[PDB]
């Protein structure tokens, strides 16, 4: 039997929390559609039990996957200090951590470590909001507008097809914003009725109007779909082409606000530092949360913004077959360090593990036989690669060192 030339010795997963009930529909949300928004089974803002089961499935799969890789044992609870789970303070991420632990090792007591203080934000997941560091206004404004084609108007103009598709799902022409229109002189248009302005401060960036509204609404339909509700978007969404068109507006906003390096680098710095320390061989030192690193597996429950910030900072790009949302609930950015038995050198591989939207819709359990979608990523800035296409430990460390914004370090 041919033996593997590479041995898996460390895994770090940054995962978006699972499907969560959207927030209460804003006044705007009901004005852009005559129809009423469907209510959810659980508190709004919280992880839905279905959301938990989906994450649990991924946990189940990862256990099977790491067992086959010889990193985890097929029987019993992982040894003390072998698996570590960290989560942002929100209910949805804490619960995502618990669901993943339950799937990876049922009945076992794997703690989900968070920042001691739950009422306050965790700078690990956004150092900008806790004032750990600030954004250079003028530089961010220029970089975002630049990636937009110079203006948000040209940006939206290039996506009118997707915007009209949204209007069709909302039946916008027979909506309050449209009907009670004060300019009956022009045809109803979301982009025209809600101009989008780029807002830049030291602790945050945002887009007003249609772009941000569209990004949120398309994600809600996705959530509906994934939650297994009767007819997402009032039965109006019928094929895969329509799903892609709709979410494209969501991915577009994230492209602008979360992947832009001038924002991504500062916002992902604490995560980059945690990831690098966890993947780098070292005795079980620390980083915080009362958890020791390095270890075998480190699971981090964060958000889609984190996945996009990390991709923007590490120059990782990806499209997910079967999943219209590039930063899907439960989506996992998997970092692995593999040692090459021959020269015993260290290499790092990155992947985006996810559940196809259908796998979410049908709540199909996962296993090696029926795995979730998986896309192997390539660090664009990596030069020193191995046959398998991985980046050397040193290269990756260099990539992290140059991309991190020290002033945003924890
Ligand atoms: Hg803890």
Describe the model.
The PDB classes it as hydrolase. Keywords: histidine acid phosphatase fold, hydrolase. The assembly is monomeric. The entry is titled "crystal structure of escherichia coli phytase at PH 6.6 with HG2+ cation acting as an intermolecular bridge". The protein: phytase. The protein is globular, with a radius of gyration of 22 Å. Strands 1, 2, 3, 8, 9, 10, 11 and 12 form an eight-stranded mixed beta sheet that branches. It has a two-stranded antiparallel sheet with strand order 4-5. The chain contains 14 helices and twelve strands. The termini are far apart. Helix content is 39%, strand content 15%. The chain is α/β, with parallel strands linked by helices and 410 residues long. The longest helix is centred in the N-terminal third of the chain and has 20 residues, at 49-68. The relative contact order is 0.17. It folds into two domains: 1-134 and 259-410, Rossmann fold (3-Layer(aba) Sandwich), CATH 3.40.50.1240; 135-258, Phosphoglycerate mutase-like (Rossmann fold, 3-Layer(aba) Sandwich), CATH 3.40.50.1240. It binds mercury (II) ion. Mercury (II) ion is lined by residues 111, 113, 289-290.
